[PDB]
């Protein structure tokens, strides 16, 4: 069974990595690019970018552990733990050559440790729409005068007593439409049909729990990254952020400059958090062009 | 029936104020003290303080509009709108003499406008465990190095789509127990029966909604207060805050210094947010002493 339709010419498959069965969608030929999704979504957020990249690259889009059709991690949900699974998966298909990485939202959290620990394996890097876990996340406001606090959900999802699963179970489709649209500028792209697909996937009980365990591990990820960030990233990097409602704005690039020697940043006007869907044309173009420099 | 047991010597009653039927519990004789509860609770959070205060004062503890047994407001939930109901209720019982005001949590939000606009009516003021709505609330963090933050619920409750009512309905007791304990230092004071009583009250559909409408009006209250605060408070004021988990710490007094010329403050170590219950005896003593001068 497939939770989301696979683009023509791609294959849906699974690979066991350190005892965990990871789902991915793969296609194309050439150097490897791995695309890593974020909270509320799956590999499918990349499905419009994937055929374009596949004309020049081998493209793999995994489901994060516990999300989509991937099994939960056996070690834990901190960034350093999850990054092992994703690094080993990529190196199964690119064992002798560096690969490219594109990551959105908690895909950043779950890849930054393996990038910094294996820099020679990463040719080029694209990060969009999330802070790298560090002390900056403690400075975001709980409540704002205009618009809405971007990351109050950090506390909601990290709260104990399984607060978030207990309240959201049975109401997953309602909650996800609210979460997605509240973090969007171009809300009209989130049709009821598309929201149905995403909601059905993260409503699987182990996926609803997995979703929030990433946030329950966030403070551990911060502590991990305080050590890892003593070495800056050396490979070419690009950041993308939305400039509209839900967007990170200038924060994405300004934080990345503390982490990367070679970084260029873009803020996409009229676009929120969900860049591949809200602003497919400019986002796809920026990513394809940046990766095609190599 | 009554949602909470009324202490001996007190009466549970109602008064119509601007077309809204307000519930309150009243006892004692002497000058008036009005006690105003906060989120998650009702008049009943004051039920241990009330008999002690009633030895020297007439004491009235209303349910906020839409909460407990009070009808929702017919104007709105912003601080200036709700304060009209509370001011007029107090003046029905103390028309010829200034009265004292004690307020906890959003009871502050719902009384500050009528205090600043009717200073001659307010003899002494006690505020505990909440910011007055102003720009300082935009500095509180969304997340902390120890886990969930103190006031991320501001955004949860203010969200549209009836987010909070929709997620909490059917889980009202579960959520309120988590909310109380995550803002407490002393959780043992919250018995099964007490949690049951508070959960049943705010689970009434119009009370669950009313609870969050106070937060959906919070930014409007901030903007109202930006103009009202051009006039400082002149009456004797006391702030109380918990020093433990859930407490406002030094913030309560430090904010109040910007609003009040005559203010004294206390931080209670080992106490969180729910001061009348977590730390009943020292909180009662400090309030009674302050009001009895």
Coordinates of C-alpha atoms in Angstrom, one line a residue:
Chain A
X1 CA 0.0 0.0 0.0
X2 CA 1.0 3.6 -0.7
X3 CA -0.1 6.5 1.4
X4 CA 0.7 9.0 -1.4
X5 CA 0.8 8.6 -5.2
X6 CA 4.3 7.9 -6.5
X7 CA 5.4 10.1 -9.5
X8 CA 5.7 8.3 -12.8
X9 CA 9.2 6.7 -13.2
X10 CA 9.8 6.6 -9.4
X11 CA 9.8 3.6 -7.1
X12 CA 8.5 3.2 -3.6
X13 CA 10.7 0.9 -1.5
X14 CA 12.1 0.2 1.9
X15 CA 15.5 -0.3 3.4
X16 CA 16.4 -1.7 6.8
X17 CA 18.9 0.6 8.5
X18 CA 20.2 -0.3 12.0
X19 CA 17.1 -2.4 12.6
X20 CA 14.6 0.2 11.4
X21 CA 12.7 -0.1 8.2
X22 CA 12.8 3.2 6.3
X23 CA 10.4 4.0 3.5
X24 CA 11.6 6.1 0.6
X25 CA 10.7 7.1 -3.0
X26 CA 13.6 7.0 -5.5
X27 CA 14.1 7.9 -9.1
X28 CA 16.5 9.4 -11.7
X29 CA 20.1 8.9 -12.4
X30 CA 23.3 10.8 -11.6
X31 CA 24.7 12.0 -8.3
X32 CA 22.5 11.5 -5.3
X33 CA 20.2 14.1 -3.8
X34 CA 18.4 13.2 -0.6
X35 CA 15.3 15.3 0.2
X36 CA 14.1 15.2 3.9
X37 CA 10.6 16.4 4.9
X38 CA 9.3 18.0 8.1
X39 CA 6.5 17.9 10.6
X40 CA 3.0 17.3 9.4
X41 CA 4.1 15.9 6.1
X42 CA 6.0 13.0 4.4
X43 CA 8.2 12.5 1.4
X44 CA 5.2 13.6 -0.7
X45 CA 5.9 17.3 0.0
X46 CA 8.7 16.9 -2.5
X47 CA 6.6 15.2 -5.3
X48 CA 6.6 18.2 -7.6
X49 CA 10.3 18.9 -7.3
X50 CA 11.4 15.3 -7.6
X51 CA 10.7 14.8 -11.4
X52 CA 12.6 17.9 -12.3
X53 CA 15.6 17.0 -10.1
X54 CA 15.5 13.4 -11.5
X55 CA 16.5 14.7 -15.0
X56 CA 19.9 15.4 -13.6
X57 CA 20.2 13.5 -10.2
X58 CA 19.4 10.3 -8.5
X59 CA 16.7 11.5 -6.1
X60 CA 15.7 9.8 -2.8
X61 CA 13.0 11.1 -0.5
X62 CA 12.7 9.1 2.8
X63 CA 10.0 9.2 5.4
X64 CA 11.5 10.3 8.7
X65 CA 11.5 7.5 11.3
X66 CA 8.0 6.9 12.7
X67 CA 6.4 9.2 10.0
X68 CA 4.9 8.3 6.7
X69 CA 5.6 4.6 6.1
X70 CA 8.9 4.4 8.1
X71 CA 9.2 2.5 11.3
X72 CA 10.0 4.5 14.5
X73 CA 13.7 4.8 15.5
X74 CA 15.1 2.2 17.9
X75 CA 17.7 4.6 19.5
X76 CA 15.7 7.8 20.0
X77 CA 14.4 11.0 18.4
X78 CA 17.3 13.4 19.0
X79 CA 18.9 14.9 16.0
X80 CA 22.1 13.0 16.4
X81 CA 20.3 9.7 16.8
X82 CA 18.0 10.2 13.8
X83 CA 20.8 11.6 11.6
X84 CA 22.6 8.2 11.8
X85 CA 19.6 6.5 10.0
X86 CA 19.5 9.1 7.3
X87 CA 23.3 9.2 6.7
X88 CA 23.5 5.4 6.5
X89 CA 20.5 5.3 4.1
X90 CA 22.1 7.9 1.8
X91 CA 25.5 6.2 1.8
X92 CA 23.8 2.8 0.8
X93 CA 23.0 4.5 -2.5
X94 CA 26.1 6.8 -2.7
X95 CA 28.9 4.8 -0.9
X96 CA 31.8 6.2 -3.0
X97 CA 30.7 9.9 -3.7
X98 CA 29.4 12.8 -1.7
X99 CA 25.7 13.5 -2.0
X100 CA 23.4 16.6 -1.9
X101 CA 20.9 17.3 0.9
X102 CA 17.7 19.3 0.9
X103 CA 15.8 19.5 4.2
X104 CA 12.6 21.2 5.4
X105 CA 11.5 22.0 9.0
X106 CA 12.5 19.1 11.4
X107 CA 14.4 17.6 8.5
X108 CA 17.0 20.1 9.4
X109 CA 17.1 18.9 13.0
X110 CA 17.4 15.3 11.8
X111 CA 20.3 16.0 9.4
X112 CA 22.5 18.7 10.8
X113 CA 24.5 16.3 13.0
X114 CA 25.4 14.0 10.2
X115 CA 26.3 16.9 8.0
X116 CA 28.7 18.3 10.5
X117 CA 30.2 14.9 11.5
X118 CA 30.6 13.7 7.9
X119 CA 31.3 16.9 5.9
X120 CA 33.2 15.1 3.1
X121 CA 30.0 13.1 2.4
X122 CA 27.9 16.3 1.8
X123 CA 28.6 18.1 -1.5
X124 CA 25.9 20.8 -1.3
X125 CA 23.2 21.6 1.3
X126 CA 19.8 23.4 1.1
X127 CA 18.0 24.1 4.4
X128 CA 14.6 25.7 4.6
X129 CA 12.1 26.9 7.3
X130 CA 13.3 25.9 10.7
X131 CA 15.9 26.9 13.2
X132 CA 18.8 24.5 13.7
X133 CA 18.4 23.5 17.4
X134 CA 20.4 25.8 19.6
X135 CA 19.9 28.5 22.3
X136 CA 18.2 30.8 19.7
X137 CA 15.0 28.8 20.0
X138 CA 14.6 29.9 23.6
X139 CA 14.3 33.5 22.4
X140 CA 11.2 33.0 20.3
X141 CA 8.1 34.6 21.8
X142 CA 5.2 32.7 23.3
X143 CA 2.7 35.3 22.1
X144 CA 2.8 38.2 19.6
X145 CA 1.2 41.5 19.1
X146 CA 0.6 40.9 15.4
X147 CA 0.0 37.6 13.6
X148 CA 0.8 34.5 15.6
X149 CA 3.7 33.1 17.6
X150 CA 5.5 30.8 15.2
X151 CA 6.7 28.2 17.6
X152 CA 4.4 28.0 20.6
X153 CA 3.8 24.4 19.3
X154 CA 7.3 23.6 20.6
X155 CA 6.0 23.6 24.1
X156 CA 2.6 22.0 23.2
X157 CA 4.3 19.1 21.5
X158 CA 7.1 18.7 24.1
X159 CA 4.7 18.7 27.1
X160 CA 4.6 15.6 29.2
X161 CA 1.6 13.4 30.0
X162 CA 1.3 12.8 26.2
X163 CA -0.7 16.1 26.2
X164 CA -0.6 16.6 22.5
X165 CA -1.5 13.0 21.4
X166 CA -4.2 12.8 24.1
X167 CA -5.9 16.0 22.8
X168 CA -5.3 15.5 19.1
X169 CA -6.2 11.8 18.7
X170 CA -9.5 11.5 16.9
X171 CA -9.1 15.2 15.8
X172 CA -6.0 14.8 13.6
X173 CA -7.6 16.1 10.4
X174 CA -9.0 19.1 12.2
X175 CA -5.7 19.9 13.9
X176 CA -3.5 19.5 10.8
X177 CA -5.6 21.8 8.7
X178 CA -5.4 24.4 11.4
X179 CA -1.6 23.9 11.9
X180 CA -0.8 24.0 8.2
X181 CA -3.0 27.0 7.3
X182 CA -1.9 29.0 10.4
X183 CA 1.7 28.6 9.1
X184 CA 0.9 29.5 5.5
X185 CA 0.6 32.6 3.4
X186 CA -0.8 30.9 0.3
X187 CA -3.4 28.8 2.1
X188 CA -5.4 28.0 -1.0
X189 CA -3.0 25.3 -2.1
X190 CA -4.0 23.2 0.9
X191 CA -7.1 21.6 -0.7
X192 CA -9.3 19.3 1.4
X193 CA -8.1 16.5 -0.7
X194 CA -4.4 17.2 0.0
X195 CA -5.1 17.7 3.7
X196 CA -6.9 14.4 3.8
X197 CA -3.8 12.6 2.4
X198 CA -1.5 14.1 5.0
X199 CA -3.9 13.7 7.9
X200 CA -4.5 10.0 7.2
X201 CA -0.7 9.4 7.4
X202 CA 0.1 11.2 10.7
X203 CA -3.1 9.9 12.3
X204 CA -1.5 6.4 12.5
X205 CA -1.0 6.2 16.3
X206 CA 2.7 5.5 16.1
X207 CA 3.1 8.4 13.7
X208 CA 1.2 10.8 15.8
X209 CA 3.4 9.9 18.8
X210 CA 6.6 9.9 16.7
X211 CA 5.7 13.5 15.4
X212 CA 5.8 14.8 19.0
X213 CA 8.8 12.8 20.2
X214 CA 10.9 14.9 17.8
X215 CA 9.9 17.9 20.0
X216 CA 10.3 16.0 23.2
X217 CA 14.0 15.4 22.1
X218 CA 14.5 19.1 21.1
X219 CA 16.4 20.1 24.2
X220 CA 18.6 17.1 23.9
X221 CA 19.3 18.1 20.3
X222 CA 20.2 21.6 21.4
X223 CA 22.7 20.1 23.9
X224 CA 24.1 17.9 21.2
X225 CA 24.5 20.8 18.7
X226 CA 26.3 23.0 21.3
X227 CA 29.2 20.6 20.9
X228 CA 28.9 19.9 17.2
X229 CA 28.7 23.6 16.2
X230 CA 32.3 24.1 17.3
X231 CA 33.2 23.1 13.7
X232 CA 31.6 25.3 10.9
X233 CA 30.2 23.8 7.8
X234 CA 32.5 24.1 4.8
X235 CA 30.4 23.0 1.8
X236 CA 28.2 25.3 -0.3
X237 CA 24.9 26.0 1.5
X238 CA 21.7 27.7 0.6
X239 CA 18.9 28.7 2.9
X240 CA 15.3 29.4 1.9
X241 CA 12.6 31.0 4.1
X242 CA 9.2 32.4 3.5
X243 CA 8.6 36.2 3.9
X244 CA 4.9 35.8 4.4
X245 CA 2.7 34.6 7.2
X246 CA 4.4 31.5 8.8
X247 CA 7.8 32.3 7.3
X248 CA 11.1 32.5 9.2
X249 CA 12.1 35.6 7.3
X250 CA 15.7 36.8 7.8
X251 CA 16.2 34.4 10.8
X252 CA 17.0 31.4 8.5
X253 CA 20.0 33.0 6.8
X254 CA 21.2 35.0 9.9
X255 CA 21.4 31.8 12.0
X256 CA 23.0 29.8 9.2
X257 CA 25.8 32.3 9.0
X258 CA 26.9 31.2 12.4
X259 CA 27.1 27.6 11.1
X260 CA 28.4 27.8 7.5
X261 CA 31.3 29.5 5.8
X262 CA 29.7 29.5 2.4
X263 CA 26.0 30.4 2.5
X264 CA 23.5 32.3 0.4
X265 CA 20.0 33.0 1.5
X266 CA 16.6 33.8 0.0
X267 CA 13.4 35.1 1.5
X268 CA 10.4 34.3 -0.8
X269 CA 7.8 37.0 -0.6
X270 CA 4.2 36.0 -0.2
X271 CA 5.2 32.5 0.9
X272 CA 4.9 31.0 4.4
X273 CA 6.2 27.8 5.9
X274 CA 5.2 25.3 3.2
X275 CA 7.5 26.4 0.4
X276 CA 7.3 23.4 -1.9
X277 CA 3.5 23.7 -2.1
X278 CA 2.8 27.4 -1.5
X279 CA 5.6 28.7 -3.9
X280 CA 6.5 25.7 -6.0
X281 CA 7.8 27.6 -9.1
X282 CA 10.3 29.9 -7.4
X283 CA 11.4 27.3 -4.7
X284 CA 11.9 24.5 -7.3
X285 CA 13.9 26.9 -9.5
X286 CA 16.2 28.0 -6.6
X287 CA 16.9 24.5 -5.5
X288 CA 17.5 23.0 -9.0
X289 CA 19.8 25.9 -10.0
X290 CA 21.8 25.7 -6.7
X291 CA 22.3 22.0 -7.0
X292 CA 23.1 22.2 -10.7
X293 CA 26.2 24.3 -9.9
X294 CA 28.0 21.1 -8.9
Chain B
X1 CA -27.5 23.1 42.1
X2 CA -24.4 24.9 43.3
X3 CA -21.2 24.0 41.5
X4 CA -19.1 24.4 44.6
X5 CA -19.9 24.2 48.3
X6 CA -20.7 27.5 50.0
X7 CA -19.0 28.2 53.3
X8 CA -21.1 28.6 56.4
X9 CA -22.3 32.1 56.9
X10 CA -22.1 32.9 53.1
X11 CA -24.8 33.2 50.5
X12 CA -24.8 32.2 46.9
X13 CA -26.7 34.8 44.9
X14 CA -27.1 36.6 41.6
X15 CA -27.3 40.2 40.3
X16 CA -28.2 41.5 36.9
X17 CA -25.5 43.9 35.7
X18 CA -26.1 45.5 32.2
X19 CA -28.4 42.6 31.3
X20 CA -25.9 39.9 32.3
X21 CA -26.8 37.7 35.3
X22 CA -23.7 37.4 37.5
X23 CA -23.2 34.8 40.2
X24 CA -21.4 35.6 43.4
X25 CA -20.8 34.3 46.9
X26 CA -21.1 36.9 49.7
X27 CA -20.7 37.1 53.5
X28 CA -19.4 39.2 56.3
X29 CA -20.0 42.8 57.4
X30 CA -17.9 46.0 57.1
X31 CA -16.2 47.6 54.2
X32 CA -16.3 45.6 50.9
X33 CA -13.6 43.4 49.5
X34 CA -14.1 41.9 46.1
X35 CA -12.1 38.8 45.2
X36 CA -11.8 38.0 41.5
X37 CA -10.7 34.5 40.3
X38 CA -8.8 33.5 37.2
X39 CA -8.6 30.9 34.5
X40 CA -9.5 27.3 35.2
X41 CA -11.2 28.3 38.4
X42 CA -14.2 30.1 39.9
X43 CA -15.1 32.0 43.0
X44 CA -14.3 28.8 44.9
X45 CA -10.6 29.4 44.8
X46 CA -11.2 32.0 47.5
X47 CA -13.2 29.8 49.8
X48 CA -10.5 29.4 52.5
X49 CA -9.7 33.1 52.5
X50 CA -13.4 34.3 52.6
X51 CA -14.3 33.2 56.2
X52 CA -11.1 34.8 57.6
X53 CA -11.7 38.1 55.7
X54 CA -15.4 38.1 56.7
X55 CA -14.4 38.7 60.3
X56 CA -13.5 42.3 59.3
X57 CA -15.1 42.9 55.9
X58 CA -18.0 42.3 53.7
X59 CA -16.6 39.8 51.1
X60 CA -17.9 39.2 47.6
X61 CA -16.5 36.7 45.2
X62 CA -18.0 36.8 41.7
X63 CA -17.7 34.3 38.9
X64 CA -16.2 36.0 35.9
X65 CA -18.7 36.5 33.0
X66 CA -19.2 33.1 31.2
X67 CA -17.4 31.2 33.9
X68 CA -18.8 29.4 37.0
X69 CA -22.5 30.3 37.2
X70 CA -22.2 33.7 35.6
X71 CA -23.8 34.5 32.2
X72 CA -21.4 35.4 29.3
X73 CA -20.8 39.1 28.7
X74 CA -23.1 40.8 26.2
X75 CA -20.5 43.3 25.1
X76 CA -17.2 41.4 24.9
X77 CA -14.3 39.8 26.7
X78 CA -11.7 42.6 26.5
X79 CA -10.5 43.9 29.9
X80 CA -12.3 47.2 29.5
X81 CA -15.6 45.5 28.7
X82 CA -15.5 42.9 31.5
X83 CA -14.3 45.5 34.0
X84 CA -17.5 47.4 33.6
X85 CA -19.5 44.4 34.9
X86 CA -17.2 43.9 37.9
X87 CA -17.1 47.6 38.8
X88 CA -20.9 48.0 38.6
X89 CA -21.4 44.8 40.6
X90 CA -19.1 46.1 43.4
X91 CA -20.9 49.5 43.4
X92 CA -24.2 47.8 44.0
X93 CA -22.9 46.7 47.3
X94 CA -20.5 49.5 48.2
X95 CA -22.1 52.6 46.5
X96 CA -20.9 55.1 49.2
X97 CA -17.4 53.9 50.1
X98 CA -14.3 52.8 48.2
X99 CA -13.8 49.0 48.2
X100 CA -10.8 46.7 48.2
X101 CA -9.9 44.5 45.3
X102 CA -8.0 41.2 45.3
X103 CA -7.4 39.6 41.9
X104 CA -5.7 36.4 40.6
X105 CA -4.5 35.6 37.0
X106 CA -7.0 36.9 34.4
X107 CA -8.9 38.6 37.3
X108 CA -6.2 41.2 36.9
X109 CA -6.9 41.6 33.2
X110 CA -10.6 42.0 34.0
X111 CA -10.2 44.6 36.7
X112 CA -7.2 46.8 35.9
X113 CA -9.3 49.1 33.6
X114 CA -11.9 49.9 36.2
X115 CA -9.2 50.4 38.8
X116 CA -7.3 53.0 36.7
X117 CA -10.5 54.7 35.5
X118 CA -12.3 54.8 39.0
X119 CA -9.4 55.3 41.4
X120 CA -11.5 57.0 44.1
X121 CA -13.6 53.8 44.3
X122 CA -10.6 51.6 45.1
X123 CA -9.3 51.7 48.6
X124 CA -6.5 49.0 48.5
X125 CA -5.4 46.7 45.7
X126 CA -3.9 43.2 45.7
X127 CA -2.8 41.6 42.4
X128 CA -1.3 38.1 42.2
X129 CA 0.1 35.8 39.5
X130 CA -0.4 37.4 36.1
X131 CA 0.9 40.2 34.0
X132 CA -1.2 43.3 33.5
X133 CA -1.7 43.1 29.7
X134 CA 1.0 45.2 28.1
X135 CA 4.0 44.8 25.7
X136 CA 5.9 42.9 28.4
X137 CA 3.8 39.8 27.6
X138 CA 5.5 39.6 24.1
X139 CA 8.9 38.9 25.8
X140 CA 7.9 35.6 27.5
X141 CA 9.5 32.6 25.7
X142 CA 7.6 30.0 23.6
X143 CA 9.9 27.2 24.8
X144 CA 12.6 26.7 27.5
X145 CA 15.6 24.6 28.1
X146 CA 13.6 22.6 30.7
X147 CA 10.5 22.0 28.6
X148 CA 7.2 23.7 28.1
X149 CA 7.1 27.4 29.0
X150 CA 4.9 29.3 31.4
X151 CA 2.7 31.1 28.9
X152 CA 2.6 29.2 25.6
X153 CA -1.1 28.7 26.5
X154 CA -1.6 32.4 25.6
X155 CA -1.3 31.4 21.9
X156 CA -3.1 28.0 22.3
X157 CA -6.1 29.8 23.8
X158 CA -6.1 32.8 21.5
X159 CA -5.9 30.7 18.3
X160 CA -8.9 30.8 16.0
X161 CA -10.9 27.8 14.6
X162 CA -12.0 27.2 18.2
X163 CA -8.7 25.3 18.4
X164 CA -8.7 25.0 22.2
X165 CA -12.4 24.1 22.6
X166 CA -12.2 21.6 19.8
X167 CA -9.1 19.8 21.2
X168 CA -10.1 20.0 24.8
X169 CA -13.8 18.9 24.6
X170 CA -14.1 15.4 25.9
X171 CA -10.8 15.8 27.6
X172 CA -11.6 18.7 29.9
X173 CA -10.6 17.1 33.2
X174 CA -7.4 15.7 31.6
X175 CA -6.4 19.1 30.3
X176 CA -7.2 21.1 33.4
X177 CA -5.3 18.6 35.6
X178 CA -2.3 19.0 33.3
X179 CA -2.6 22.7 33.2
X180 CA -2.9 23.1 37.0
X181 CA 0.0 20.7 37.7
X182 CA 2.3 22.2 35.1
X183 CA 1.8 25.6 36.8
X184 CA 2.0 24.3 40.4
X185 CA 4.8 23.7 42.8
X186 CA 2.5 22.0 45.3
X187 CA 0.3 19.5 43.4
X188 CA -0.9 17.6 46.5
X189 CA -3.5 20.3 47.4
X190 CA -5.4 19.4 44.2
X191 CA -7.5 16.4 45.3
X192 CA -9.6 14.2 43.0
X193 CA -12.7 16.0 44.2
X194 CA -11.3 19.5 43.7
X195 CA -10.1 18.7 40.2
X196 CA -13.5 17.1 39.5
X197 CA -15.3 20.3 40.7
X198 CA -13.3 22.7 38.6
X199 CA -13.4 20.4 35.5
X200 CA -17.1 20.1 35.6
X201 CA -17.6 23.8 35.8
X202 CA -15.4 24.9 32.9
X203 CA -16.5 22.0 30.8
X204 CA -19.9 23.6 30.3
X205 CA -19.7 24.4 26.6
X206 CA -20.3 28.2 27.1
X207 CA -17.8 28.2 29.9
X208 CA -15.1 26.4 27.9
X209 CA -15.6 28.9 25.2
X210 CA -15.7 31.9 27.6
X211 CA -12.4 30.7 29.1
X212 CA -10.6 31.1 25.8
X213 CA -12.4 34.3 24.7
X214 CA -10.5 36.2 27.4
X215 CA -7.3 35.2 25.6
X216 CA -8.7 35.9 22.1
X217 CA -9.2 39.5 23.5
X218 CA -5.8 39.7 25.1
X219 CA -4.1 41.8 22.3
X220 CA -7.1 44.1 22.3
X221 CA -6.7 44.4 26.1
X222 CA -3.0 45.3 25.6
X223 CA -4.0 48.1 23.2
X224 CA -6.6 49.4 25.6
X225 CA -4.1 49.4 28.4
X226 CA -1.5 51.3 26.4
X227 CA -3.8 54.3 26.7
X228 CA -5.2 53.7 30.2
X229 CA -1.7 53.3 31.7
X230 CA -0.9 57.0 31.0
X231 CA -2.5 57.5 34.5
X232 CA -0.6 55.9 37.3
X233 CA -2.3 54.1 40.2
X234 CA -2.3 56.0 43.4
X235 CA -3.9 53.7 46.0
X236 CA -1.9 51.3 48.2
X237 CA -1.1 48.2 46.3
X238 CA 0.4 44.8 47.1
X239 CA 1.6 42.1 44.6
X240 CA 2.0 38.4 45.4
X241 CA 3.8 35.9 43.2
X242 CA 5.1 32.3 43.6
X243 CA 8.8 31.8 43.7
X244 CA 8.6 28.1 42.7
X245 CA 7.6 26.3 39.5
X246 CA 4.7 28.2 37.9
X247 CA 5.4 31.4 39.8
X248 CA 5.9 34.8 38.2
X249 CA 8.8 35.5 40.5
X250 CA 10.1 39.0 40.6
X251 CA 8.2 40.0 37.4
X252 CA 4.9 40.7 39.3
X253 CA 6.3 43.4 41.5
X254 CA 8.7 44.8 38.9
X255 CA 5.9 45.3 36.4
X256 CA 3.6 46.8 39.0
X257 CA 6.3 49.4 39.9
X258 CA 5.6 50.8 36.4
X259 CA 1.9 51.1 37.2
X260 CA 1.7 52.0 40.9
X261 CA 3.3 54.7 43.0
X262 CA 2.7 52.9 46.3
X263 CA 3.4 49.2 45.9
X264 CA 4.8 46.5 48.1
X265 CA 5.5 43.0 46.9
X266 CA 6.2 39.5 48.1
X267 CA 7.5 36.4 46.4
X268 CA 6.6 33.2 48.1
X269 CA 9.3 30.5 47.9
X270 CA 8.0 26.9 47.4
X271 CA 4.8 28.2 45.8
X272 CA 3.6 28.2 42.2
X273 CA 0.7 29.8 40.4
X274 CA -2.3 28.6 42.4
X275 CA -1.5 30.7 45.5
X276 CA -4.8 30.5 47.4
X277 CA -4.6 26.7 47.3
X278 CA -0.9 25.9 47.0
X279 CA 0.0 28.3 49.7
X280 CA -3.2 29.2 51.4
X281 CA -2.0 30.1 54.9
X282 CA 0.8 32.6 54.1
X283 CA -1.1 34.1 51.2
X284 CA -4.2 34.6 53.4
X285 CA -2.0 36.1 56.1
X286 CA -0.4 38.6 53.7
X287 CA -3.7 39.7 52.2
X288 CA -5.5 40.0 55.5
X289 CA -2.6 42.0 57.1
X290 CA -2.3 44.3 54.0
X291 CA -6.1 45.0 53.9
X292 CA -6.4 45.4 57.7
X293 CA -4.0 48.4 57.9

